[PDB]
Design a binder for these strands. Structure first.
Lengths: 257, 171, 125
RNA sequence: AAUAGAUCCGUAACUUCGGGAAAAGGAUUGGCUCUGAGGACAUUAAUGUUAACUCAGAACUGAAACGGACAAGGGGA
RNA sequence: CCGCCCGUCGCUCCUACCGAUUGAAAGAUAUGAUGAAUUGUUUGGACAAGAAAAAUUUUUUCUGGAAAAACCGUAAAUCCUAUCUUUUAAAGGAAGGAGAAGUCGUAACAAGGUUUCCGUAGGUGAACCUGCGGAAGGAUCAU
RNA sequence: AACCUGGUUGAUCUUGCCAGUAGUCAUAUGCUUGUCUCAAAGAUUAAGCCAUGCAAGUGAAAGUAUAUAUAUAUAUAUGUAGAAACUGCGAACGGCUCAUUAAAACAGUUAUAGUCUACUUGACAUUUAUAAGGAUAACUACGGAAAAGCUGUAGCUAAUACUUGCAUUAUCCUUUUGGAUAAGUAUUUGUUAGAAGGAAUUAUAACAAAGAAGUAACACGUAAAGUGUGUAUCAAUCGAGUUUCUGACCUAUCAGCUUUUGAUGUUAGGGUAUUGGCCUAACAUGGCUAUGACGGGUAACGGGGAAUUAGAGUUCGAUUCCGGAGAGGGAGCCUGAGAAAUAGCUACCACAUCUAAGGAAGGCAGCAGGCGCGUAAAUUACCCAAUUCUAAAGAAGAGAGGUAGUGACAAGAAAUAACAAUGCAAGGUUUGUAUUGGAAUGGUGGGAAUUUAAAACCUUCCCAGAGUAACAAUUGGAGGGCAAGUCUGGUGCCAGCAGCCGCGGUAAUUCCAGCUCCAAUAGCGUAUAUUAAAAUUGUUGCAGUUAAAACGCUCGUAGUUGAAUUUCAAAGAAUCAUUCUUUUUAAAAUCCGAUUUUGUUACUUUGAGUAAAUUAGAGUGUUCAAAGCAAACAGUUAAAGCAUUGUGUUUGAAUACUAUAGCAUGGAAUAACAAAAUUGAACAAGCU
């Protein structure tokens, strides 16, 4: 037969997983869930290869059996569970809160967050569907369906979501002043202010985004995530703060130590 | 049973590898006659069920100028645009022309409108005479081989004139 | 199936196998650095050709171009760490001009002989 | 003795390019019930009256039989 | 120039060609004939269960239904015919190449002793000869 | 490293090829081989045939246990487990091979507004109830058959197997509150209205008809109420099927193909998950082609890539990854979300096993292994410890995979000595050089630490353990090309050598040997293929009077190529003498003297989207290197950092490339195209 493939070769695994060539022949194929395989990491590699808490897949299973780690404040026990673009990971035994984010080099990093911040996740609405009774549901990047969204919410907006109650707290638009984070391009991981939006009829819409140091980079509309307004990002950011640097001058700051 | 083994657009013959797949399928046709209601179940892809009707007597039929649907029984099949064998062997297909009982429609008209929503449509004489006869012409609109039920609407106006001329400068 | 770790050759055969002056120069280098084989000098000049090709490709690129102002100092700092270029050197023409004995001076046996320890280069080997 | 009518298909070497050729070699053929196509004539684009047998197709039917008798090439190297 | 050199004819070996033999073999297509297995539909009808009654038994009916059969369809496989492809036998015929001091002549290179060569046609043991029209790559850059 | 050399001659200069030369992740083979690391390996021919064994199973809270065993207060309640079996899930993944396949497959680029989608994730439902029905496995008893993963009859019992079946919500109004009104999820039909998309016959809503399947008659227990299993629809996700544009080797001694037998299109239908001649009926005569259709060949799976490269190129790619196809050859089919599945079934063909002769059973192009074929390719080993998959998901499996064995396929590092004194040679008491004679160290053997699933290897330590360091390096040459002998014997146009030129008939620098020398070196020859050499396939970049090569000549279509012409300059700051930066200067619409767009394409510039492996390349002392993607830092035993007493800290795994085609994008030059008169406009006023 020719049903669904269920194995992942190591070299065929996504590059940002950073799995080594000689470390076996297979990679953990993420289970279907909230996020795409390409734009997520399984928590097995999250807490084996990144946090180094576990040394083997069996040790990952050992961690997961005890209902300790929670993804969006709810317990996850699947070994190949897709954690996804941005959300909170709570480990109760060590009492630590992580937010999954992108570094300026396009890789998934667990960024330390406070307990207070671990309740404020950001969701990028991807569709607005009205079902029976003129009731509107927002489908987000998280694969999550939020019924009864505020009618002002648009298809490329973002909404702050409360993990405990699963409710929207406020929304964020996509003007030319709303700061965004790029998610999948050459400029994956950059944080900018959106200089302009060019809407091509029937093709990909492009948006030009201005960095903090006034350098402009363009990207596809589907590959951005509104984070905040011009005032500040609504979430905390990794140490680079979404600021990518030219390689010729990353070397100088590497050398000065 | 779909896609390959034909000639190319240029008329050339294409060599055939890739033996037949299941998803190409091609189930045999259902020559739905009219008779005591009997349908079978076909398990299509994804365990979706398709109702293959073999015989029907009745079905929903719509008076479209009033937009009202009533269940009636199919008396005969008299015309079909495709193969003329279909009417002769009395098979029900999607665009078939049938003769159905009009008594439910006449009784409904008497009950609601009186006499023999957006009411007062004024009817037409060509359909009125058919009602007076008691059997009325209709066009099927469902696919009995797919949905398992014959169902259609009463033809009126220019299309009714067209089909009446085509059935019976004429023989 | 197949292993995923790479492997590459480190030497290139000279071609024209019987040049008298080339053989003499090779023997001079072999004897005066006390190394066992001319395969070793072939490795050294294979490495030298690698560095030289990188240098000339960089020289073709115009000044203040990004590729040059990254790779040029990458290569220059590698050469300086290897000791192949001095402080009075600052440009890419000198890494173009560095030579086979200058490369061979950095072998362990030559350095230990120069520092003492062993009284002959073969003793150092 | 073997087919041999008709319809459909297919037809080689050779050739004086005209033929060879009905080459060779295949299939079908009844009855019945139908369907389709092929004309002529008058009224103020449209509606009626009326005629030949000629093809094509489909169901059904029979002890698989149908150029049913009659009539009627054996081919090839 | 006692240079070089051409061809026929003899002998040996090798390669390839034509070849009667309705030559042979293996494949691949196409048509036709027969046609396993089987989807679907229909015809079925072992029974298995229900509904009725008498105070162990009977009729009728409802579905559900196994063998079996038929008809469209999917169609393996076999056979006939035709064509094509590849390989291959063969009396005889006719080439090419190589070999050896073989036989016959002297065609070409000198004006090579008839200048050479081309196209064409005929003839002859062979190189070749001859006719017609060309070229100089001629043996003439020239009253 | 952008390279040439020997060979036509009496001698010369050419053309021209032969030969030499080097590489090959390129195969075989010959000789030889002391270490360590690394690791290709029955592709080539036979997608030929296979003995044997293994390769997919699964129960740790959570479907069904009087098979059975056990333990606590006392036949009672709890339990703990549990063979078998029913049920659920998986077995459609993986692994192998490259036969088929030439616009097919594949790749980049689209579409699915033409579809299906299990597990998983988020939302969240509609027309006897203190809990409903039979019927079956396991098991028991009687059996049959030579034999099989064969099974008959009788008897019972379960289930999350199979099957029935039990409130409520919303809306209108006086206006927290009172009455009033209504009740089907998908899907199909008819009539209508109509947050998003680029465009809707969209979402959705109303009316009139049908209408599936469901909404728990199910099982275990978390905060000092939860979970599992199952269920309708939508969405997400893991995918899939079709689909747009563009891209392929040789052949014209393949020029016309396709079209009754669907070829191209229309209409209607059937069928499908969906679109579609996919199929059917009617109709029309279309569709492709010298820009190579249709055929034929391929010793052709495609791509990522590989070899060779100065730049172009040429050749290869069975083979780590992706996509496709197949399971001896065909065809058909069941279950299932997913198969036209093959360690699933059915039949035919070819093979082939057992048989008591009646009948059964099979598919190694899975892992080993065998035969055969060959020039050509390993162990019938160990293990699930790592990677990962399946399950009732810790605990079981896995010839996937890993480990070791064979292994001069390739690749990397690297032994076979080093040193002191005379004698000798050279030189103004300096280098080389047979004697001695003490150090050093591996190879090797043994024990150990360690490593490892176990073991082995590496590494490390401890004992022995080198003088002819017998612990003894080979391969191929010595006329030229081409480094190295007119040295010594044998042979004597023989034997033989010789890639080519040539040597060999008594002086053989070429044969057969010895000595010596040369080359490369644990490697070196040979054969075949391929690249460079080859500017001897030439776009860059060949040649054509006589070396091969201008058609006999002209016309001529396709193709290729095509005169000039339409908007030019001045002024201002900064390096060094110059260079470089900036503003405007016709006309039409925009803003009340100023606010700003003014053909199409090629082409060119920037981006976007680019799987990794490989490549280039950044960083990083694997003891170096091949490598790998790591790692680095203080700590004879604690300072510092931060936290309001403890917590290690700092990191890296970049960038580039990813066609020529497609998307977006600045553009003045160069090219085309468009518009442009036997005429074609624009404006104003009046008129419709």
């Amino acid at each position: 037969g020719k049903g669904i493939k269920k194995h992942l070769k190591r070299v065929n695994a996504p590059s940002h997983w950073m799995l080594n060539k000689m470390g076996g022949q297979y990679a953990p194929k993420t289970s279907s869930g909230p996020h795409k395989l390409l734009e997520s990491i399984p928590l097995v590699i999250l807490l084996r290869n990144r946090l180094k808490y576990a040394l083997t897949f069996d040790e990952v299973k050992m961690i997961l059996i005890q209902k300790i780690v929670k993804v969006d404040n709810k317990v996850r026990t699947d070994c190949t569970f897709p954690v996804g673009l941005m959300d909170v990971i709570h480990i109760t035994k060590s009492n630590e809160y992580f937010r999954l984010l992108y570094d300026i080099k396009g890789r998934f990093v667990p960024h330390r967050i406070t307990n207070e911040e671990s309740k404020y996740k950001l969701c990028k609405v991807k569709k607005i569907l009205l079902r029976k009774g003129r009731l509107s549901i927002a489908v987000t990047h998280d694969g999550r369906s939020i019924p009864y969204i505020h009618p002002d919410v648009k298809v490329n907006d973002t909404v702050r979501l409360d993990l405990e109650t699963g409710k929207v707290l406020e929304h964020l638009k996509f003007q030319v002043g709303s700061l965004v984070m790029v998610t999948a391009g050459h400029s994956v991981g950059r944080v900018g202010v959106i200089s302009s939006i060019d809407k091509n009829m029937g093709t990909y819409d492009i948006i030009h985004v201005k960095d903090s140091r006034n350098k402009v980079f363009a990207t596809r509309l589907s590959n951005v995530f509104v984070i905040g307004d011009n005032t500040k990002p609504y979430i905390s950011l990794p140490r680079e703060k979404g600021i990518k640097l030219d390689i010729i001058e990353e070397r100088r700051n590497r050398l000065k130590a | 049973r779909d896609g390959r083994h034909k000639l190319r657009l240029t008329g050339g013959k294409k060599k055939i590898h890739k033996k037949k797949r299941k998803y190409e399928l091609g189930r045999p046709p259902s020559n739905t006659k009219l008779g005591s209601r009997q349908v079978h179940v076909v398990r299509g892809r994804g365990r979706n069920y398709k109702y293959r009707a073999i015989k029907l007597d009745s079905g929903s039929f719509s008076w479209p100028t009033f937009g009202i649907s009533k269940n009636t029984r199919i008396i005969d099949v008299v015309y079909n645009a495709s193969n003329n064998e279909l009417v002769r062997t009395k098979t029900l297909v999607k665009n078939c022309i049938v003769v159905i009982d009009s008594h439910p429609f006449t009784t409904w008209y008497e009950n609601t409108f009186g006499t023999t929503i957006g009411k007062s449509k004024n009817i037409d004489p060509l359909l009125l005479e058919q009602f007076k006869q008691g059997r009325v012409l209709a066009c099927i609109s469902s696919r009995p081989g797919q949905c398992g039920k014959a169902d259609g609407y009463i033809i009126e106006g220019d299309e009714l004139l067209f089909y009446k001329r085509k059935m019976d400068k004429r023989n | 199936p197949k292993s995923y770790r790479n492997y590459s050759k480190t030497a290139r055969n000279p071609k024209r196998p019987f040049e008298k002056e080339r053989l003499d120069q090779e023997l001079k280098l072999i004897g005066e650095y006390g190394l066992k084989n001319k395969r070793e000098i072939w490795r050294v000049q294979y490495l030298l050709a690698k560095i030289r090709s990188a240098a000339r490709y960089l020289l073709t690129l115009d000044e203040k171009s990004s590729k040059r102002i990254f790779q040029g100092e990458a290569l220059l700092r590698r050469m300086v760490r290897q000791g192949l270029l001095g402080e009075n050197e600052e440009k890419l023409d000198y890494v173009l001009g560095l030579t086979l004995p200058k490369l061979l001076e950095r072998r362990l046996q030559t350095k230990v002989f120069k520092l003492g320890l062993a009284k002959s280069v073969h003793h150092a080997r």
